[PDB]
Design an enzyme around this catalytic site. Structure first.
Site, short mmCIF file in Angstrom:
data_model
loop_
_atom_site.label_atom_id
_atom_site.label_comp_id
_atom_site.label_asym_id
_atom_site.label_seq_id
_atom_site.Cartn_x
_atom_site.Cartn_y
_atom_site.Cartn_z
N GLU A 35 0.84 -1.33 -0.08
CA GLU A 35 0.00 0.02 -0.05
C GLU A 35 0.84 1.31 0.06
O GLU A 35 0.57 2.06 -0.80
CB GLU A 35 -0.94 0.00 1.28
N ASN A 46 -7.69 10.17 -5.63
CA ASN A 46 -8.10 9.52 -6.74
C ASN A 46 -9.29 10.45 -7.33
O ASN A 46 -10.38 10.93 -6.84
CB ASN A 46 -9.02 8.26 -6.05
N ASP A 49 -13.05 9.78 -8.17
CA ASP A 49 -14.30 9.82 -7.21
C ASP A 49 -14.11 10.88 -5.90
O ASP A 49 -14.59 11.00 -4.96
CB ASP A 49 -14.62 8.33 -6.52
N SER A 51 -11.76 11.20 -3.82
CA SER A 51 -11.30 10.56 -2.52
C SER A 51 -9.88 10.65 -2.41
O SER A 51 -9.21 10.64 -3.61
CB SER A 51 -11.91 9.27 -2.09
N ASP A 53 -6.61 8.43 -0.59
CA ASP A 53 -6.02 7.21 0.40
C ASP A 53 -4.92 8.00 1.24
O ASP A 53 -4.15 8.54 0.83
CB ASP A 53 -5.48 6.26 -0.42
N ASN A 60 -8.99 5.12 2.86
CA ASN A 60 -9.83 6.07 1.97
C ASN A 60 -10.77 7.09 2.95
O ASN A 60 -11.47 6.56 3.84
CB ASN A 60 -10.45 5.35 1.01
#
Length: 130
Positions: A35, A46, A49, A51, A53, A60
């Site tokens: 990750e 992102n 959308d 969002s 991380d 998220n």
């Protein structure tokens, strides 16, 4: 902070991650590795959308933490996403525990399915004294 492999293994162990929700420490290490490369300030926006991380486990913003800029998002860990960018990973670990209490468990993270599920992950904890 960018953790060294074994330093992180013991850090997660002290935080109660070994066998949490039936998930071995090696699995959590494989998750963090793929990750963020064990980096607590890792972030990924992102565009699709809106969002983001956050942190070592790339949690998220749509569902787990509040950053005030993700449309119609919630905050199930009841934390500011900033809390997931701390060198001290206690809050990130408490949130990761909350994530796995959901229907999917560790499968919530697609990267775990891609690089950890049904793989030989023993290598992540070998020699760490955990």
């Amino acid at each position: 902070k960018v953790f060294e492999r074994c330093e992180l293994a013991r850090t997660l162990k002290r935080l109660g991650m070994d066998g949490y929700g039936g998930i071995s420490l090696a699995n959590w290490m494989c998750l963090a590795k793929w990750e963020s490369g064990y980096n607590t300030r890792a972030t990924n926006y992102n565009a699709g959308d809106r969002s983001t991380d956050y942190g070592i486990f790339q949690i998220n913003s749509r569902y787990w933490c509040n950053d005030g800029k993700t449309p119609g998002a919630v905050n199930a860990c009841h934390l500011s996403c900033s809390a997931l960018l701390q060198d001290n990973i206690a809050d990130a670990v408490a949130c990761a525990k909350r994530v796995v209490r959901d229907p999917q468990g560790i499968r919530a993270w697609v990267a775990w399915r891609n690089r950890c599920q049904n793989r030989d992950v023993r290598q992540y904890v070998q020699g760490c004294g955990v």
